[PDB]
Ligand binder design. Sequence first.
Ligand SMILES: Nc1nc2c(ncn2[C@@H]2O[C@H](COP(=O)(O)OP(=O)(O)NP(=O)(O)O)[C@@H](O)[C@H]2O)c(=O)[nH]1
Ligand SMILES: Nc1nc2c(ncn2[C@@H]2O[C@H](COP(=O)(O)OP(=O)(O)NP(=O)(O)O)[C@@H](O)[C@H]2O)c(=O)[nH]1
Ligand SMILES: [Mg+2]
Ligand SMILES: [Mg+2]
Lengths: 155, 155
Amino acid sequence: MEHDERTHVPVELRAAGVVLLNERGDILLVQEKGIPEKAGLWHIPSGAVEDGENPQDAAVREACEETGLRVRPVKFLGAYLGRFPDGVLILRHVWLAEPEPGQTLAPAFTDEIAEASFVSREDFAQLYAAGQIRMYQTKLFYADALREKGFPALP
Amino acid sequence: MEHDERTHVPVELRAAGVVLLNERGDILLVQEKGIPEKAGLWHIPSGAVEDGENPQDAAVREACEETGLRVRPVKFLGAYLGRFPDGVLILRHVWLAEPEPGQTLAPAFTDEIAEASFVSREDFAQLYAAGQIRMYQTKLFYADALREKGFPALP
Ligand SMILES: Nc1nc2c(ncn2[C@@H]2O[C@H](COP(=O)(O)OP(=O)(O)NP(=O)(O)O)[C@@H](O)[C@H]2O)c(=O)[nH]1
Ligand SMILES: Nc1nc2c(ncn2[C@@H]2O[C@H](COP(=O)(O)OP(=O)(O)NP(=O)(O)O)[C@@H](O)[C@H]2O)c(=O)[nH]1
Ligand SMILES: [Mg+2]
Ligand SMILES: [Mg+2]
């Protein structure tokens, strides 16, 4: 910052993801694989930022790795901080993104990902109310993205 | 985010700024006004992000407010965390930016800003060695910006 003294707060982990909207304002979400009979929760395409690599590039890379979609970062939306039980800090970065044209959703099925898909604003609202969105920040950023693009707001 | 539980670490303040490079790779820096007064230290154009407002837009706004230059954010470079003595956290955001053409540097002289100017890579290296760069992160991000644009690295 400026001249008022402050100490450094080391952030060991950083993650980057995107709020990817299509032409209708639907959001691209990734689902966790399980949790016995409960479905895994949903989150935005996002993954770890390699130490030293640009978080913006990581967001783009991760989106493609998880959904098979090449995306273009449109605008930075925000970053927020979390702390694991052991004290490790993680800074999550989020960008508004748009998919490049002529692509087919093809999720990467792993022990961490069950699938990925576009969800409408209306159904997202239901998922959120149902407690199926892992990080509530997803709703906050989806709302921001909708406003930025000029789409109607969540129900 | 991705299912391992973590707590929220509230960040009360957010700042946004830019590493603005011209066609030669010179960097735009802002100088503090004093304190034993002579020679205030240098920092990138940066200012407080209004609560709720987009940090990227804030970086662009602040750059214009402090230097008189309208700038275009080119790419996100990074964000880092600091803590004031009272415990308040501040998250600083940095973008690589380019000035729009046909502009004249016209700094905003206030009780916080002595002036602003473009400094060459060579002189920046001297300023840094001389301990005249308030936040060392400035050198780290300047280095990142130079690599991104394809300019030679700092001495
Ligand atoms: N408890 C705990 N969790 C950790 C630790 N280190 C990493 N993690 C977890 O490992 C994750 C690393 O993945 P990350 O890059 O954040 O990806 P992500 O985008 O959050 N996952 P997604 O979105 O696919 O579910 C963190 O989000 C965090 O949950 C640790 O020391 N302790
Ligand atoms: N010690 C201390 N200083 C504070 C606190 N809040 C604000 N400040 C000081 O007040 C200044 C202005 O507020 P802040 O939002 O941090 O400014 P900024 O936009 O980040 N500044 P800059 O653009 O120059 O980096 C800061 O640069 C910091 O020096 C606080 O709780 N404790
Ligand atoms: Mg990964
Ligand atoms: Mg200000």
